[PDB]
Design a protein around this ligand. Structure first.
Ligand SMILES: [Mg+2]
Ligand SMILES: [Mg+2]
Ligand SMILES: [Mg+2]
Ligand SMILES: [Mg+2]
Ligand SMILES: [Mg+2]
Ligand SMILES: [Mg+2]
Ligand SMILES: [Mg+2]
Ligand SMILES: [Mg+2]
Ligand SMILES: [Mg+2]
Ligand SMILES: [Mg+2]
Ligand SMILES: [Mg+2]
Ligand SMILES: [Mg+2]
Ligand SMILES: [Mg+2]
Ligand SMILES: [Mg+2]
Ligand SMILES: [Mg+2]
Ligand SMILES: [Mg+2]
Ligand SMILES: [Mg+2]
Ligand SMILES: [Mg+2]
Ligand SMILES: [Mg+2]
Ligand SMILES: [Mg+2]
Ligand SMILES: [Mg+2]
Ligand SMILES: [Mg+2]
Ligand SMILES: [Mg+2]
Ligand SMILES: [Mg+2]
Ligand SMILES: [Mg+2]
Ligand SMILES: [Mg+2]
Ligand SMILES: [Mg+2]
Ligand SMILES: [Mg+2]
Ligand SMILES: [Mg+2]
Ligand SMILES: [Mg+2]
Ligand SMILES: [Mg+2]
Ligand SMILES: [Mg+2]
Ligand SMILES: [Mg+2]
Ligand SMILES: [Mg+2]
Ligand SMILES: [Mg+2]
Lengths: 233, 52, 121, 252
RNA sequence: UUGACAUUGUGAAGAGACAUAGUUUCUUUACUUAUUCAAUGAAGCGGAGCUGGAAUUCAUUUUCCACGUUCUAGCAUUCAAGGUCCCAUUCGGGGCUGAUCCGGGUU
RNA sequence: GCUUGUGACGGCCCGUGAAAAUCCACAGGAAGGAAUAGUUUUCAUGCCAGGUCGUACUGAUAACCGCAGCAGGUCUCCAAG
RNA sequence: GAUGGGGAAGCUCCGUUUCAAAGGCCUGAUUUUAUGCAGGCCACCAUCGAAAGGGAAUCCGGUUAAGAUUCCGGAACCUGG
């Protein structure tokens, strides 16, 4: 009202400068950005082979959450704790005279790529998580087939870092359980079954399915309307 | 021109030291008239829509 | 949740923290002593016959002076080495690559006095 | 032998264009939002002489719709376009001399100049003191348009490709006898160093395929193959016919 | 310059052989992510929807275009005036809408 | 009158006869600013400061280049009866 | 003619705003304090290249064996502060 006035701006070509708008769709990103987006895109447009496209099929958030819950109970020794343990046998064992066994038997998760593999190969692993990042994918592509062959139940998981955190590394590439306290066996055999249902079991079937061949949605629609009109007149 | 009282570089009118006054005359006239016609352009085709 | 809003289509180098030098050891152990003290600035008086004539008549002192020294440095040092005040310093590089300062005292000081105080005549 | 004259011109030393006095490069507006969804107005603030050009340029200023400021383009003046005039650039733009329109929107018969080869190459066809192109038909599916160039060669370009309504100024320039050496002198003065021309027949063998002999004579056939190699190609390269053109011309 | 091999991938119609099941090979014609070319201070792309309306209803929409500027040598900028929400009322300042939605494939 | 400067014009061109630093103006109106006293340094007057390198002379029938104090060569301003 | 680059066995050749994450001004936020963050801009992206091109400002008189629009005398003007 007052001595105020409505003057609504016309923005329709020919007149009044455009306003500031959001141009995030339109920005000249740094090349390393372009390269990493184009990379992912290129990887979906090609026809990816089945012994690669079997990854991408990751564990689901529910099941996994249960797996990281269980594995957390078994983290490997800490900085402090080991120093703390070592003096509970440097002192204790050497004098009171134990068999280097005034320490209890360790129950921790197994990790390190070359470590986990001999384990699998020796049928000693009992549940293995393979990462899904892993850039030299080769480091890990054989792991599904191995486990399958060794009849060791396995699951591809999201987070080379989430594997990393649970073992005090930045990244880990693989986590494994061999041992397990009896009071936990229950929870694990449970996990093994769900996991095996989605991986080891479906494996032979995954083996025939080439991934990718996915259009961008400019062209995905361009034929979703072309195939729509041509047929059904 | 930077060593000179500001009056030497201007005349006392709209668009003073910058356009020739018969130019100012012109762009006032055209301003008024075109701003006016804008009114005659709007309400006229405001009738078009209502009588169509 | 959701993304950034950029109104500009151009990207630029994120203005990042420019940390300052905190050397773990030192540049040169000992800083150099002043490379041009008054004494190095003004070298000898000039006492050509024609030089002198500027001291009787002109109230001007003539100094072969450092090539490395400018009109300021010459003034400050004639000032401080001799108690006097300077109106103006003119300078000129000799045809033998030594520099000459026509130093002109202010009207309070009788140069000729001032000349055979330093002891030339 | 010596490197013959035509070879030397490529290394471009004393040859390169004489660039310095030239209003700038003539060009259409960039092909932005406005010009391909609607149209946009500007005024020819000036038509002027480009040096070494036949046809007058046309300074034409527009608003910039993404920043408050003027942005001036440089057009080749079609005929009859005039200072103070309004000029329209766009798909949805009226069809009068001086406006710039996509070739898709002009009825056939339309006469246009400075036309784009691909759309948005800012002009590239018939820009020369006199010439123009004729829109001789369209094909809506795969929106092409067919045009005739000044060469008589017919060509088909996309319909989004713009070109400007009318013909280029400076008509009839080549109709006036140059008359004396100096006029061509001053002609090429502001083009490039290509005049005067010694005849390859007046040189010695070191200098030219034609050089030498105790009479002036080409001594072998002057119709030279396409495959001919550098330093050979002088005369009637790739000539498919030769001799005085008898009878009518004009592409049938 | 011309051919072959490599760079070289994805479909579909037609040829070509174990001799009329589809592994393979080529002719034709699609694909776009390799390679290639252009433009731009990578600005408005692609897809959906609001409104109008030509359109003719064979049950109601089956669709097609539109979806801010053209007598004039003016003027168009301060995240925009307006509207609405907040700060705790100070001067100042912020959200949203004004400027619809989705996909980040610069075209 | 001579020389030069300069203006208003006219002829010529398929020739229409640089660029940047730099200085001013205007459009704009964010803002800041008075009555017990504010705003004002494009008005006047007033204060301090201005470094570095070159500065001589020949410029030619002897100071430059032609083996030289060579009848050669070597860019220009001023101009009396 | 450097630079992000791309060629080249290599000395080096190409390119000069070009397939680049290219950089700095105004005052505000400080009243721990010296300058961190807060706005808003501006995307111009080296440098060298003229003692005849562009360009802030000085004159007259006197003076030397030999300097002077440079010193002496008087009178100015410009630029920064
Ligand atoms: Mg523990
Ligand atoms: Mg005045
Ligand atoms: Mg006046
Ligand atoms: Mg005395
Ligand atoms: Mg000097
Ligand atoms: Mg050139
Ligand atoms: Mg010539
Ligand atoms: Mg000839
Ligand atoms: Mg000839
Ligand atoms: Mg001869
Ligand atoms: Mg020969
Ligand atoms: Mg021959
Ligand atoms: Mg011959
Ligand atoms: Mg002959
Ligand atoms: Mg673009
Ligand atoms: Mg404000
Ligand atoms: Mg003269
Ligand atoms: Mg003229
Ligand atoms: Mg001015
Ligand atoms: Mg003043
Ligand atoms: Mg300084
Ligand atoms: Mg002299
Ligand atoms: Mg002389
Ligand atoms: Mg002599
Ligand atoms: Mg000599
Ligand atoms: Mg001589
Ligand atoms: Mg270079
Ligand atoms: Mg320079
Ligand atoms: Mg100069
Ligand atoms: Mg004198
Ligand atoms: Mg003397
Ligand atoms: Mg003299
Ligand atoms: Mg004086
Ligand atoms: Mg005085
Ligand atoms: Mg001052």
């Amino acid at each position: 009202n007052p001595l105020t006035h409505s003057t609504p701006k016309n923005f329709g070509i020919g007149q009044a400068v455009q306003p500031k708008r959001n141009l995030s769709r339109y920005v000249k990103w740094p090349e390393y950005v372009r390269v990493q987006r184009q990379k992912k895109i290129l990887s979906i447009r090609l026809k990816v082979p089945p012994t690669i496209a079997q990854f991408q099929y990751t564990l689901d958030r529910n099941t996994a959450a249960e797996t990281f819950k269980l594995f957390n109970k078994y983290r490997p020794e800490t900085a402090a704790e080991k120093k703390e343990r070592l003096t509970k046998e440097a002192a204790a064992v050497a004098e009171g005279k134990s068999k280097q066994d005034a320490s209890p038997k360790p129950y921790a998760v197994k990790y390190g790529l070359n470590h986990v593999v001999a384990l699998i190969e020796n049928k000693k692993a009992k549940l293995v998580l393979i990462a899904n990042d892993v850039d030299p994918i080769e480091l890990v592509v054989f792991l599904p087939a191995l486990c399958k062959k060794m009849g060791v139940p396995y699951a591809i998981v999201k987070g080379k870092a989430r594997l990393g955190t649970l073992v005090n590394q930045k990244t880990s590439a693989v986590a494994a359980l061999t041992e397990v306290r009896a009071e936990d066996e229950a929870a694990l055999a449970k996990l093994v079954s769900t996991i095996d249902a989605n991986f080891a079991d479906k494996y032979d079937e995954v083996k025939k399915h080439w991934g990718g061949g996915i259009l961008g949605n400019k062209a995905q629609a361009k034929m979703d309307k072309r195939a729509k009109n041509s047929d059904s007149a | 021109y930077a060593t000179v009282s500001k009056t030497h570089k201007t005349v006392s009118r709209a668009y003073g030291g910058s356009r020739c006054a018969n130019c100012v005359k012109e762009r006032i006239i055209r301003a008024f008239l075109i701003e006016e016609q804008k009114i005659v352009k709007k309400v006229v085709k405001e009738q078009t829509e209502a009588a169509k | 949740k959701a993304l950034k809003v950029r109104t500009s289509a151009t990207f630029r180098l994120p203005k990042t923290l420019k940390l300052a030098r905190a050397p773990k050891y030192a540049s040169k152990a000992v800083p150099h002593y002043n490379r041009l003290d008054s004494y190095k600035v003004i070298e000898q008086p000039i006492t050509s016959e024609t030089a002198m004539k500027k001291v009787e008549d002109g109230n001007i002192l003539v100094f072969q002076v450092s090539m490395k020294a400018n009109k300021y440095q010459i003034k400050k040092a004639v000032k401080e080495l001799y108690e006097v005040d300077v109106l103006k310093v003119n300078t000129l590089v000799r045809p033998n690559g030594t520099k000459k300062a026509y130093v002109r005292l202010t009207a309070d000081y009788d140069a000729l006095d001032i000349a055979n105080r330093i002891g030339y005549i | 032998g010596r490197v013959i004259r035509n070879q030397r011109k490529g290394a471009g030393s004393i040859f390169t264009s004489h660039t310095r006095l030239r209003q700038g490069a003539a060009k259409l507006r960039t092909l932005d939002y406005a010009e391909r969804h609607g149209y946009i107005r500007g005024i020819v603030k000036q038509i002027v002489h480009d040096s070494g050009r036949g046809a007058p340029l046309a300074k034409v200023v527009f608003r910039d719709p993404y920043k408050y400021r003027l942005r001036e383009e440089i057009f080749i003046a079609n005929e009859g376009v005039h200072t103070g005039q309004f000029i329209y650039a766009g798909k949805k733009a009226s069809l009068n001399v001086g406006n710039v329109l996509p070739l898709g929107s002009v009825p056939e018969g339309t006469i246009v100049s400075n036309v784009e080869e691909k759309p948005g190459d800012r002009g590239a066809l018939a820009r020369a003191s006199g010439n123009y192109v004729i829109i001789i038909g369209h094909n809506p599916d795969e929106n092409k348009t067919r045009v005739r160039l000044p060469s008589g060669a017919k060509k088909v370009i996309s319909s989004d490709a713009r070109g400007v309504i009318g013909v280029i100024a400076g008509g009839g320039r080549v109709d006036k006898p140059l008359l004396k050496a100096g006029r061509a002198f001053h002609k090429y003065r502001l083009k490039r160093n290509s005049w005067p021309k010694t005849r390859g027949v007046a040189m010695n063998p070191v200098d030219h395929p034609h050089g030498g002999g105790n009479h002036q004579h080409i001594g072998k056939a002057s119709t030279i193959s396409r495959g001919a190699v550098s330093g050979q190609k002088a005369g009637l390269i790739a000539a498919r016919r030769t001799g005085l053109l008898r009878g009518s011309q004009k592409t049938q």
